[PDB]
Amino acid sequence: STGSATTTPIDSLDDAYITPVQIGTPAQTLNLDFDTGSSDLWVFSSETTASEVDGQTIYTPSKSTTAKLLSGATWSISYGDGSSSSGDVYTDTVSVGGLTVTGQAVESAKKVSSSFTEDSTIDGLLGLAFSTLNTVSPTQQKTFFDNAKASLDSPVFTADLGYHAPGTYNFGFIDTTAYTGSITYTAVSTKQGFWEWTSTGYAVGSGTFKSTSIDGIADTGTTLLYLPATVVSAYWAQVSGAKSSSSVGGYVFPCSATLPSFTFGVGSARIVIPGDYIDFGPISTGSSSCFGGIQSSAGIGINIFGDVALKAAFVVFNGATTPTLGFASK
């Protein structure tokens, strides 16, 4: 089997991407944030505290003839950005772009943190990291990809995120028309439950390439590119007027400035992030100060190849017995 779904930016800045997901019988369609940095499929639901729902589409298990309470099961997650949610668990039929999993754990939110409430466009998350990170207790549950894997034509999914435009998640096949040149594959460590890999280095604009190992995760659920402070400093030093602002919480720059590209290495291959991808607009309405899309990972404890990086590539998440990651230009 295969599946193929369009993923759509939630706003004009590509702050996140939502993908429609069918849950239950008859189908309830929710727009979920596909997140290769976590491993829970959780949704706004009829069980969510009423005051914490503000425009989201909810899953109502009682209206699904295939929903079954996973008795005794609870879940609770906190994300790197300080947000969180928790609740109980159902199993139900879940379909993505034609690909159907029966008995998928659907984690129903009783509580969500304010950032989730305040974002009307995201109805939940669909985690695509390794199932070892799944928070369901007492019995850890598998991700949608893990459940589908054996049935897929090939045990892979791909992320093709657009810049200020829709893109595609495919399951079970590699669309050879979706990228240029070849796909370069690189090793993955699953020891922290992430799609964790080591970039071979970077360049800033037309600058020479710096060969240096950068361990990080391929994370569709994180908006920006978070790299070591040395790397980030070298980037913004090439932007006139750029500065790190403690009050804003990162590098900002005047919108009149031209942003250089940023290149990262995948083995001997090179992925070029155009400068425009690194502009996240005014810090506040009407401000001439713009927020940067490359920021320091210092104090996160890990480097994160988020959407800013991934949307410059066609990315293969290869779930073979030994997982690997593939990157192509496009």
Last residue of a domain, one of 143, 174, 205: 174
Give the CATH number of the domain where residue 309 resides: 2.40.70.10
Tell me, rounded to whole angstroms, the distance of Cα 69 from its chain centroid: 28
Q: Last residue of some domain: 150, 174, 198?
A: 174
Residues counted in the chain = 330
State the SS3 of the chain.
CCEEEEEEECCCCCCCEEEEEEECCCCEEEEEEEECCCCCEEECECCCCHHHCCCCCCECHHHCCCCEEEEEEEEEEECCCCCEEEEEEEEEEEEECCEEEEEEEEEEEEEECHHHHCCCCCCEEEECCCHHHCCCECCCCCCHHHHHHHHCCCCEEEEECCCCCCEEEEECCCCCCCCCCCCEEEECECCCCCCEEEEEEEEECCCCCEEEEEEEEECCCCCCEEECHHHHHHHHCCCCCCEEECCCCEEEEECCCCCCCEEEEECCEEEEECHHHHEEEECCCCCCEEEECEEECCCCCCEEECHHHHCCCEEEEECCCCCEEEEECC
Residues 187 and 110 in one domain: no
Q: Is the peptide bond before 26 cis (omega within 30 degrees of 0)?
A: yes
Same domain, 154 and 240: no
> What does the block give as tokens for 258?
């031209």
Check whether residue 166 and residue 247 sit in a common domain: no
Alpha carbons 126 and 163: distance in angstroms, whole number: 21
Does one domain contain both 60 and 127? Answer: yes
Task: Return the active site residues.
Answer: 35, 199
Answer yes or no: do 73 and 36 share one domain. yes
> 103-120 burial, b for 16+ CB within 10 Å, e for fewer?
ebbbbbbbebbeebbebe
Question: Is the same domain home to 75 and 195?
Answer: no
Residues 6+ apart with CB under 8 A from 7: 17, 18, 19, 34, 161, 162, 166, 167, 168, 169
Kindly state whether residues 45 and 66 are assigned to the same domain.
Answer: yes
Query: How was this structure obtained?
Result: X-ray
In total, how many domains does the chain have?
Answer: 2
Distances (CA, A) of 292 to 160, 184, 192, 280, 308: 22, 28, 28, 6, 10
The encoded tokens of residue 69 equal 């309470």
Q: Using CA atoms, how far apart are residues 234 and 321, in angstroms rounded to an integer?
A: 38
One domain for residues 246 and 130: no
Q: Are residues 35 and 126 in the same domain?
A: yes
Range of the domain at 272: 175-330
Angle at 160 between CA 323 and CA 261, to 5 degrees: 100
**CA dist., res. 213 & res. 193, Å (int):** 20
Contact predicate 93/25, CB 8 Å: yes
Angle at 40 between CA 110 and CA 5, to 5 degrees: 110
Burial of 303 (0-12, 13-18, 19+ CB in 10 A): buried
Instruction: Report d(CA 129, CA 171) in Å as an integer.
Output: 14
Residue in the block written with tokens 């979920």: 32
Judgement on whether residues 139 and 82 belong to the same structural domain of the protein: yes
Experimental resolution (Å): 1.6
Query: Could you give the dihedral angle defined by the CA atoms of residues 57, 63, 67 and 69, in that order, rounded to the nearest 10 degrees?
Result: 90
Is residue 49 located within the same domain as residue 99?
Answer: yes
Task: Please tell me whether residues 237 and 290 are part of one structural domain.
Answer: yes
Nearest of 264, 263, 259, 291 to residue 276 by alpha carbon: 259
The C-alpha atoms of residue 146 and residue 103 are separated, in whole angstroms, by: 12
Assess contact for 16 and 79: CB atoms under 8 A.
Answer: no
What residues have CB less than 8 Å from 104, skipping those under 6 apart? 41, 91, 92, 93, 94, 144, 147
Residue 146: name the closest of 41, 32, 25 by CA. Answer: 41
CA–CA distance, 42 with 40 (Å, rounded to integer):
6
- 313 to 189, 290, 317, 328: CA distances (angstroms): 20, 24, 12, 5
